[PDB]
Amino acid sequence: DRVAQLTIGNSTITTQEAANIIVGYGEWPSYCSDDDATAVDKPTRPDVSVNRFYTLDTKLWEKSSKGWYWKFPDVLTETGVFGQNAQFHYLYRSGFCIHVQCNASKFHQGALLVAILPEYVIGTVAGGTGTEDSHPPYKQTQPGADGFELQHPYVLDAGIPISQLTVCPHQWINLRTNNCATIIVPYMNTLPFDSALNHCNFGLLVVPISPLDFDQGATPVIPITITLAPMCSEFAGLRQAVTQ
Amino acid sequence: DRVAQLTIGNSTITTQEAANIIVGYGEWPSYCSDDDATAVDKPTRPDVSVNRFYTLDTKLWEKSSKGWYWKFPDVLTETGVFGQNAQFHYLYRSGFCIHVQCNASKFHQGALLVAILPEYVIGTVAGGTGTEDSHPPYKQTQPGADGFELQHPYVLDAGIPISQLTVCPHQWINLRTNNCATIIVPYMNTLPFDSALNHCNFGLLVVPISPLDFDQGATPVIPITITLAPMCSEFAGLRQAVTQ
Amino acid sequence: DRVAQLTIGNSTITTQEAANIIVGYGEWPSYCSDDDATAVDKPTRPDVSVNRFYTLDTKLWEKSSKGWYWKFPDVLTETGVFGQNAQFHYLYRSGFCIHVQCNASKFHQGALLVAILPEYVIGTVAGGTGTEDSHPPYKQTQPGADGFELQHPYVLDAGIPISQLTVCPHQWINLRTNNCATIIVPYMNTLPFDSALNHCNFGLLVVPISPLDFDQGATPVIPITITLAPMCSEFAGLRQAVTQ
Amino acid sequence: DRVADVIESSIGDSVSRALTQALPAPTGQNTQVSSHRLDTGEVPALQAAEIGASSNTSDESMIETRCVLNSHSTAETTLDSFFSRAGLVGEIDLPLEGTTNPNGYANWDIDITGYAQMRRKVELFTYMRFDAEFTFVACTPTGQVVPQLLQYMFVPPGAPKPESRESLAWQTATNPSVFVKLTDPPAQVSVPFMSPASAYQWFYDGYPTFGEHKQEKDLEYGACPNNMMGTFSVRNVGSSKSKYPLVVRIYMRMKHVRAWIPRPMRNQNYLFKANPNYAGNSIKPTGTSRTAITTL
Amino acid sequence: DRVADVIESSIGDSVSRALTQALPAPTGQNTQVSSHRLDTGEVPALQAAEIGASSNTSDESMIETRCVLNSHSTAETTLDSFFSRAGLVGEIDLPLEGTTNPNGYANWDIDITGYAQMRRKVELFTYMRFDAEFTFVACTPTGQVVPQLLQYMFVPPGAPKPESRESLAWQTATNPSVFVKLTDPPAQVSVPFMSPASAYQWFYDGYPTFGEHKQEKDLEYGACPNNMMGTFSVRNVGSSKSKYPLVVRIYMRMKHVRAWIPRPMRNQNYLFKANPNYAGNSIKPTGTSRTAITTL
Amino acid sequence: EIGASSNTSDESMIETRCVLNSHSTAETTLDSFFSRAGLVGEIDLPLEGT
Amino acid sequence: SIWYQTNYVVPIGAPNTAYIIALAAAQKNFTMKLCKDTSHILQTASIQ
Amino acid sequence: ETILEVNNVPTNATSLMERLRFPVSAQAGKGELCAVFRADPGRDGPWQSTMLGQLCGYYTQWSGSLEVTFMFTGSFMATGKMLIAYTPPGGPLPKDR
Ligand SMILES: CCCCCCCCCCCCC/C=C\[C@H](O)[C@H](N)CO
Ligand SMILES: CCCCCCCCCCCCC/C=C\[C@H](O)[C@H](N)CO
Ligand SMILES: [Cl-]
Ligand code: NA
Ligand code: NA
Ligand code: NA
Ligand code: NA
Ligand code: NA
Ligand code: NA
Ligand code: NA
Ligand code: NA
Ligand code: NA
Ligand code: NA
């Protein structure tokens, strides 16, 4: 139960210090029913070429880090064959298998909260005073694969408490216990299909709740890598490639 | 029998002056058997997103035209989702439905020979004298979607007689009879899969055997358009996108 | 299906470039039921003497024509035995078989919209400004067999769009395709019988949607002839002949 | 005849594999007798929060319990019990003199996000599907009931919004309208679920249109048209100025409620309607604070 | 349970739908009696070459024919009858003095494309699979048979090619070798189909490697490694110079032949081995010409 | 020219999937369309005027 | 968007310009819901 | 089917009847653009001339496939091939064929 292997497509992930697997809302990704669908054109289900593990950028965990987030359909729109299909097709649909990995040693300590927040809408500080109706820039609402850093993690940059973020599919990475978190997310939206460009079904939040710490001499560079794989990907409404 | 419709993917072709359909070597495109295959990885069969009609550039038929040719896996390697898969995957396999269209009027005349020549290797004039071992440039062996014009059609730029080119799946476009040619080609190669970049399974030749002619006053611009659709496309050996 | 013959009474129409036959609202003309009737006197059903093809005036299609219209019970009230019965009897009832014919050559072009508009009430331009409550004269509301020309075809001289006139039993005469239009109309009114003099059940509209055109040298006179035959004619309420 | 990986393929399975099942729970769970347990191998108290699952430890395994037949109902915590309570969601002013709807008519953009109480509750969930019951309480600014006839009209998106008290749009040949006197009891009406989506979204993490998303258009981020149900218009049924100043309060009661995906409850004060902006200089803690962690 | 377009899907069909079938034809077709036919509607003589199919008109429908029981065999036109005839494909010189293999050994790159007769025949087809029988005829340049012992060695690609008459590679611990005297009848041996492909390609329209294809490397266009079977090495079995000048002619006879996709037959003179280059200034017609089209 | 609308269906123009359409056609019946009260008359009974 | 696949070809004696008429409608799976008033009201002043 | 005013350009008093049809003619052979229009039924534009577009105006929402039939009214001797394309949402107006 502490060891596990995730194989999908032509990619395999290994781990010897896992903490089980979470299946968001107790549901596995699935394809769209014939009665839940509307688009009449036959969709493309590329399978193995898009349903595989993509490893996005690595972040560095510092004793003062606040946390980061990634919007999901988004992080992959410019990567591999998944990205190509997401650009050529109007409609997209899929679940995800998210595997956040971060290892240290038996002498390091700290705890990361890895959670999935559906429809993660970002807010602004409203000019500090709260009298200015400002809005988050495109660079912040859809940060891409590089993710974005939280400025006010306590309120998740959206006026909501992070202490309650656990009502969402989550898992923790407690260095003294495990070195990775695995969460499987089904397609969640009020529509059977939607644009992979304009809409971000959910956001991945990785936030240090218990600060990283260690004594001088132990390796100081502790990376946090994000690996994710689409599941049951379906695309429809073919046309030319659109970036945004 | 003179009228026809070809629907595949999200594209439909219409014609009211056709001359039946030719099925190269009496075989329809099909997927690779489990006993004819070697690559052990599960292939991608994108279906509708790649098996559809792509319309390449248009050529102008002049009273002095010599003819043109297109190498096939090639013409599509930089177009649509077919091109993306052909670039991301090492191995490719597929048949094609080629539809060459060219219309005129009941007062114009001329005949085009539309043929498919497998393994169409191009030769050079050898410096004219035949003492120089020169070779055709990349721009000529794999002309892309713009096709390439024949310099010596009588010998097909390869030292072989065009008068015998009819032993290959072909069809004619005789302006007084039909305004299009349809040829369906199965995957032909000595291997179950091959690179869509390094190898060109066959070449499409469109050559005027009977010169175009008409009296001054009749529209002088007579285009020849090439539309083609992959069939039973399969890709394997995924990696990063490679252009060549 | 391109050829047809319409025989009724002692008249026969021939055509070798037809486009099927339209049966207005999917109903054939029929006689009045014993439960739909009110007038107690036994009606006259002259049959062959009135249910035959009457050929009204011919119009000339010019490169600048706007279109014409004919009110129907009306066009025939002063012709043949049908007219006599329509004048001697108070009540009239009948369907019609309308055959508009217009031929050209394989070098002429243009398209006429031939439609049937029930209760075709004519309006006026209201003195241009729209402040004058003027009304169309008798010569325009009931033009007789000579028909009347449209002044503002776009609005059918009644403030309604001609682009939607196709929701009515119609047919087109596209010179490159057919040279006639045949429409069969059942008796339509909110009463089982009505006066053939005061009321016009419907109007026949012949309007050029695609202008007539040809090169100088081709015959310039292109006529449009209207032939029509009553069907299941019934008359009642006999008295002296009344013209209006 | 057909490739094996295609036969044994599972691409196409439209049924969602659910790991959990909804069981009957009309009352709180009972407690069963428990005795001492002195053994190795079994440790109910020890958990691993890293897994992401809440502790499954029960009272019985932590202390010696008695038997309690719990018959406390769980009915008042259903979604309908929680949301089926009318609350203020709109307020329209029709003054005699001023700069706010002084021409005897008003157009209220249908949005229940203008009031904190009602808004915070619904924002506990991401998606919600429901029918509703709207009640319109009208009177003057002093609460005085006046003999005045009003006309409320629902203008779905695309329909012509009235530009004046005598607008032609007040003919309501197709839009639903309600004519009431302020002396009659508040008008009440039933509304169905009219979104083109399968549910309303209190949160839409995306943009409504394609193209470049420049600074000037960031106004559209988080704006979902599937939630924009149209306008609510009011007017004095007349052609002259009303003799009294009016106010119309709109209350909404949800019925037949379905809800999905719960979220953290609003932590900071609300500032605007179309977004979750908060005052960055006044970020207050979720709750109360104290001097020391070792003292109450 | 599963989406319908996936159930009714046909992606995966590995069986090739063939519109034609191979029928027995041990002899030429017979002719049947035919009589006059004066009728409308049926026109055997009229065809439409545009369709791309050869005329299906038969003798019987064009003229009044008798009955002929044709018993002419079609056996001599099978692929084996056509190709199973030994022909020259290689020629190796081992002179005493010169600049061409003067050290008593030679390495012939196995390629049957060096001689026109044999080459033109095989190039009638695009792909070919077959076993072969190689015969080596050796003697001096005058045709004189000399008492000399030679060693032929097949060096598959990857094996060490001999660099001299006394090379260590002549130990043939694994490579197949043949030791013969010129006084013995020509050595003959059987070779299997040793390509990693399912057939040899006389034409390969592509490049063997990826990357940029610059002017300098156009040398590789049309070069297929699946046809490069290795080297054939010869030497005087000794450590001193031979007393006579030698020549080795290599003949090849194909057996168990399969062939696919016919092509137009070579029209112009051959110039090189690895390609179809032709002399652009000497492009001759496929055949003979005449003065006028109306005179023989 | 025939005067009839195109009978071509989605299925014959592109490769379609299966969609079980359960969208009601009830709101487009004549009663749904016309059974909505609308202004058709307006009568004035002033104190002074013409 | 309509594009020329090849070209509009014609002999001598025939017009160099022709017209196309587009007719539009809905399919059998077309449905509408939620009645409202059309965006336009064909009236300016009282109708007399 | 009712006439779709794709050529909704002429507003002149005498030129209203020509919005009902658009031109096609001999070109230069480079896949030239002929006409363009949004497929949106209840939106201001060409569809406003159709019965469908008019009935839509009375409903807030719609669903379903649409169809557009193009009738060529040239002469019998005129030939040609056109490519009518439909670009789903997100796809900007295609720059070329
Ligand atoms: C006289 C008739 C009046 C009829 C009024 C009908 C009102 C129907 C209101 C439906 C309101 C749905 C509100 C749902 C979501 C919010 O608008 C969005 N979250 C705002 O962003
Ligand atoms: C003493 C043992 C000698 C054994 C010699 C074995 C020779 C086997 C030769 C196989 C030759 C296959 C030739 C086939 C294709 C040509 O090489 C290519 N078309 C050249 O481009
Ligand atoms: Cl629309
Ligand atoms: Na599903
Ligand atoms: Na618990
Ligand atoms: Na209980
Ligand atoms: Na107004
Ligand atoms: Na096969
Ligand atoms: Na024959
Ligand atoms: Na025989
Ligand atoms: Na050596
Ligand atoms: Na239809
Ligand atoms: Na249905």
Q: Write out G4-47 in H/E/C secondary structure.
A: ECCCCECCCCCCCEEEEEEEEEECCCCEEEEECCCCCCCCCCCC
Closest Cα in chain B, distance from residue G13 (Å): 8
**What is the sign, positive or negative, of the torsion defined by CA atoms of B75, B81, B85, B88?**
positive
CB–CB contact H88 A195 (8 Å): no
Residue listed under structure tokens 């999935």: A116
User: What is the token pair recorded at H60?
Assistant: 């807030």
| SS3 label, residue H7 | coil
DSSP C61-125: E-TT---EEEEHHHHTTTSHHHHHHHHHEEEEEEEEEEEEE----TT-EEEEEEEEEET------
The residue whose C-alpha atom lies closest to atom 5 belonging to ligand 1 is D154
**What is the sign, positive or negative, of the torsion defined by CA atoms of C24, C25, C28, C31?**
negative
* Best residue for ligand 1 mutational test, from D136, D152, D229 (most atoms within 8 Å of Cβ): D229
CB atoms within 10 A of CB D8: 7
Bridge partners for D255 per DSSP: D131
CB atoms within 10 A of CB H57: 18
The CA distance from E164 to E169, in Å, is: 9
Tell me if F3 sits within 8 A of C172, measured CB to CB: yes
The size of the B-H interface in CB pairs under 8 A is: 26
Going by the DSSP 8-state scheme, the letter that residue A90 receives in this structure is: E
**At D93, which helix (H) or strand (E)?**
strand D87-94
Give the determination technique.
X-ray
Q: How far is CA H72 from CA B5, B67, D172, F2, in A?
A: 18, 32, 43, 14
User: What is the token pair recorded at H15?
Assistant: 């030129």
Kindly provide the residue ranges of all beta strands, DSSP E only, lying in chain B, ordered along the sequence.
Answer: 4-8, 11-15, 22-23, 54-61, 68-71, 89-101, 109-118, 148-149, 170-174, 180-185, 202-213, 222-238
* B231 backbone φψ class: left, alpha, beta (φ>0; ψ -120 to 50): beta
For chain E, what are the domain ranges? 1-296
Going by the DSSP 8-state scheme, the letter that residue C154 receives in this structure is: G
- Residue from H79, H83, H87 to probe the interface with B (highest B Cβ count within 10 Å): H79
* C125 backbone φψ class: left, alpha, beta (φ>0; ψ -120 to 50): alpha
Tell me if B110 sits within 8 A of B61, measured CB to CB: yes
CA E135-E136-E142 angle, 5° bins: 135
- Residue from D168, D195, D226 to probe the interface with G (highest G Cβ count within 10 Å): D168
Angle at which helix A80-88 crosses helix B80-88, to 10 degrees, equals: 180
The CA distance from A205 to A148, in Å, is: 10
Dihedral, E89, E95, E98, E100 alpha carbons, nearest 10: 30
Q: Report the half-sphere exposure of C2 (CA within 13 A, side-chain side).
A: 6
Phi and psi torsions of A155, nearest 5°: -110, 15
Tell me if A26 sits within 8 A of A188, measured CB to CB: no
The CA distance from E162 to E147, in Å, is: 24
Indicate which atom in ligand 1 lies nearest the CA of residue D202. Answer: 19
Q: What is the CATH number of domain D1-296?
A: 2.60.120.20
User: What is the token pair recorded at E207?
Assistant: 């490049």
Kindly list the residues from chain H whose CB atom is less than 8 angstroms away from the CB atom of residue F6.
1, 67, 69
Tell me if A31 sits within 8 A of A178, measured CB to CB: no
- Of the candidates E185, E162, E166, which has an alpha carbon nearest to the alpha carbon of residue E175? E162
CB atoms within 10 A of CB D208: 15
Q: Which residues contact D23 (CB under 8 A, 6 or more apart)?
A: none
- Of the candidates D190, D200, D61, which has an alpha carbon nearest to the alpha carbon of residue D127? D200
Buried b (16+ CB within 10 A) or exposed e, E208-237: eeeeebeeeebeebbebebbebbbbbbbbe
B10 burial (CB, 10 Å; 0-12 / 13-18 / 19+) is: buried
Indicate which atom in ligand 1 lies nearest the CA of residue D152. Answer: 1
The CA distance from C14 to G29, in Å, is: 40
Residue listed under structure tokens 């915070």: D120
- Residue from A109, A119, A187 to probe the interface with D (highest D Cβ count within 10 Å): A119
Residue B215 is labelled as binding a ligand:
yes
Amino acid letter for position E236:
N
Nearest CA in chain E to B169: E52
| SS3 label, residue A154 | helix
Tell me if E99 sits within 8 A of E223, measured CB to CB: no
User: What is the token pair recorded at A91?
Assistant: 């409609």
The CA distance from H15 to E40, in Å, is: 55
CB atoms within 10 A of CB D129: 17
Facing C109 at nearest CB: one of H49, H54, H74: H74
Bridge partners for E19 per DSSP: none
| SS3 label, residue D171 | helix
Closest Cα in chain F, distance from residue D175 (Å): 8
CB atoms within 10 A of CB A12: 11
Q: Which residues contact C26 (CB under 8 A, 6 or more apart)?
A: none
Closest Cα in chain A, distance from residue B31 (Å): 16
Tell me if B193 sits within 8 A of E293, measured CB to CB: no
User: What is the token pair recorded at C65?
Assistant: 């024509």
CB atoms within 10 A of CB G40: 9
Q: Is the CB of E108 under 6 A from ligand 2?
A: no
> How many distinct helices (H) and strands (E) make up chain F?
2, 0
Tell me if A172 sits within 8 A of A100, measured CB to CB: no
Bridge partners for E94 per DSSP: E246
* B25 backbone φψ class: left, alpha, beta (φ>0; ψ -120 to 50): left
DSSP A99-124: EEE----TT-EEEEEEEEEET-----
Q: Is the CB of E199 under 6 A from ligand 2?
A: no
Kindly list the residues from chain F whose CB atom is less than 8 angstroms away from the CB atom of residue A34.
17-20
* Cα Rg of chain C, angstroms: 19
CB atoms within 10 A of CB G19: 24
Residue listed under structure tokens 């439209």: D14
List, edge to edge, every strand of the sheet that includes A54-61: A22-23, A180-185, A89-101, A222-238, A54-61
The CA distance from A185 to A26, in Å, is: 9
The CA distance from G45 to B214, in Å, is: 64
The CA distance from C224 to G37, in Å, is: 42
**At D234, which helix (H) or strand (E)?**
strand D231-236
* Best residue for ligand 2 mutational test, from E83, E118, E119, E200 (most atoms within 8 Å of Cβ): E200
DSSP B94-140: EEEEEEEE----TT-EEEEEEEEEET------TTTTT-S-----HHH
Q: G28 CA distance to ligand 13 centroid (A)?
A: 10
Q: Report the half-sphere exposure of H53 (CA within 13 A, side-chain side).
A: 25
CA end-to-end span of chain E:
77
Nearest CA in chain A to H97: A240
The alpha carbon of residue D139 and the mean position of all alpha carbons in its chain are separated, in whole angstroms, by: 26
Buried b (16+ CB within 10 A) or exposed e, B81-117: bbbbbbbbbbbbbbbbbbbbbbbbbebbebbbbbbbb
Report E:30-49 residues touching A (Cβ under 8 A). none
The architecture in CATH of the region A1-244 reads Sandwich (2.60)
Going by the DSSP 8-state scheme, the letter that residue B86 receives in this structure is: H
**At A81, which helix (H) or strand (E)?**
helix A80-88
Helices (H), chain D: 4-7, 59-62, 79-83, 116-122
Tell me if A134 sits within 8 A of A126, measured CB to CB: yes
Amino acid letter for position B194:
D
Nearest CA in chain G to D175: G36
Kindly list the residues from chain D whose CB atom is less than 8 angstroms away from the CB atom of residue H90.
210
Closest Cα in chain F, distance from residue A77 (Å): 25
Q: Report the half-sphere exposure of D166 (CA within 13 A, side-chain side).
A: 9
The size of the C-H interface in CB pairs under 8 A is: 60
Ligand nearest to the backbone CA of D58: 5
**What is the sign, positive or negative, of the torsion defined by CA atoms of H3, H7, H8, H14?**
negative
Buried b (16+ CB within 10 A) or exposed e, E13-48: bbebeeeeeeeeeeeeeeeeebeeeeeeeeeeeeee
Q: B169 CA distance to ligand 10 centroid (A)?
A: 29
**At H54, which helix (H) or strand (E)?**
helix H51-56
Kindly list the residues from chain E whose CB atom is less than 8 angstroms away from the CB atom of residue D3.
12-14
The CA distance from E48 to A99, in Å, is: 65
Beta strands B89-101 and B222-238 are antiparallel
E243 burial (CB, 10 Å; 0-12 / 13-18 / 19+) is: exposed
* Best residue for ligand 2 mutational test, from E112, E135, E136 (most atoms within 8 Å of Cβ): E112
The CA distance from D153 to D235, in Å, is: 9
Going by the DSSP 8-state scheme, the letter that residue B146 receives in this structure is: G
Instruction: Verify D-C touch: 3 or more CB pairs within 8 A.
Output: no
Q: Is the CB of E83 under 6 A from ligand 2?
A: no
Helix, strand, coil: what percent of chain B each, to 5? 15, 40, 45
* Cα Rg of chain B, angstroms: 19
Residue C215 is labelled as binding a ligand:
yes
User: What is the token pair recorded at C60?
Assistant: 């000339």
Whether the CB of F11 is below 8 Å from some CB of chain H: the reply is no
Tell me if G11 sits within 8 A of B107, measured CB to CB: yes
Instruction: Verify H-E touch: 3 or more CB pairs within 8 A.
Output: no
The residue whose C-alpha atom lies closest to atom 10 belonging to ligand 2 is E229
DSSP E46-113: ---GGGS------HHHHS----B----B-GGGSHHHHH-S-EEEEEEEE-SSSSSSTTSEEEEE--GG
Tell me if D182 sits within 8 A of D150, measured CB to CB: yes
- Of the candidates E160, E146, E125, which has an alpha carbon nearest to the alpha carbon of residue E246? E146
Q: Which residues contact D15 (CB under 8 A, 6 or more apart)?
A: A30, A33, E1
| SS3 label, residue C141 | helix
Phi and psi torsions of C108, nearest 5°: -95, 165
List Cβ<8 Å contacts ≥24 apart for H43-49: H45/H8, H46/G22, H46/H4, H46/H5, H46/H6, H46/H8, H47/G24, H47/H4, H48/H5, H48/H8, H49/C161, H49/C163, H49/C164, H49/H2, H49/H3, H49/H4, H49/H5, H49/H8, H49/H19, H49/H20
Report F:2-31 residues touching C (Cβ under 8 A). 2-4
Residue listed under structure tokens 């030129």: H15
Amino acid letter for position A210:
S
CB–CB contact D210 H89 (8 Å): yes
The CA distance from C160 to C59, in Å, is: 24
The CA distance from D169 to B56, in Å, is: 53
User: What is the token pair recorded at C117?
Assistant: 């508009």
The CA distance from E222 to E202, in Å, is: 9
* C140 backbone φψ class: left, alpha, beta (φ>0; ψ -120 to 50): alpha
Tell me if E33 sits within 8 A of E65, measured CB to CB: yes
* C110 backbone φψ class: left, alpha, beta (φ>0; ψ -120 to 50): left
Tell me if E172 sits within 8 A of E258, measured CB to CB: no
* H57 backbone φψ class: left, alpha, beta (φ>0; ψ -120 to 50): alpha
Q: B119 CA distance to ligand 8 centroid (A)?
A: 19
* E143 backbone φψ class: left, alpha, beta (φ>0; ψ -120 to 50): left
Tell me if B237 sits within 8 A of B89, measured CB to CB: yes
DSSP chain E: -B-HHHHS--TTB-S--BS------SBPPPB--------SS--TT---GGGS------HHHHS----B----B-GGGSHHHHH-S-EEEEEEEE-SSSSSSTTSEEEEE--GGGSHHHHHHHTTEEEEEEEEEEEEEEE-TTS-----EEEEEEE-BTBPPP-STT-GGGG-SSS-EEEEETTS--EEEEE----SSSSEES---B-SS-S---GGGGGGTT--GGG---EEEEEESSSS--SS-EEEEEEEEEEEEEEEEE-----S----SSS----TT----SS---S-TT--
CB–CB contact D196 H61 (8 Å): yes
Kindly list the residues from chain G whose CB atom is less than 8 angstroms away from the CB atom of residue C109.
14-15, 18
**What is the sign, positive or negative, of the torsion defined by CA atoms of A119, A120, A126, A129?**
positive
Q: Which residues contact A110 (CB under 8 A, 6 or more apart)?
A: A61, A104, A174, A175, A208, A210, A211, A212, A213
Q: Which residues contact B6 (CB under 8 A, 6 or more apart)?
A: B12, B13, B53, B97, B99, B182, B229
CB–CB contact G7 B106 (8 Å): no
The residue whose C-alpha atom lies closest to atom 8 belonging to ligand 2 is E191
Tell me if C208 sits within 8 A of C112, measured CB to CB: yes
Closest Cα in chain A, distance from residue E9 (Å): 11
CB–CB contact C154 H3 (8 Å): no
Q: Which residues contact E291 (CB under 8 A, 6 or more apart)?
A: none
The CA distance from B43 to C165, in Å, is: 55
The size of the A-B interface in CB pairs under 8 A is: 56
Closest Cα in chain H, distance from residue G44 (Å): 19
Phi and psi torsions of D27, nearest 5°: -140, 170
The CA distance from B79 to G20, in Å, is: 31
User: What is the token pair recorded at E217?
Assistant: 């490397």
CB–CB contact F38 D173 (8 Å): yes
User: What is the token pair recorded at C225?
Assistant: 């002839």
User: What is the token pair recorded at H71?
Assistant: 């009738």
Tell me if D261 sits within 8 A of D98, measured CB to CB: no
Q: Which residues contact C224 (CB under 8 A, 6 or more apart)?
A: C58, C59, C60, C61, C100, C101, C102, C112, C206
Q: How far is CA F15 from CA B53, B223, E12, in A?
A: 12, 29, 17
- Of the candidates A65, A151, A72, which has an alpha carbon nearest to the alpha carbon of residue A113? A65
Q: Is the CB of D111 under 6 A from ligand 1?
A: yes
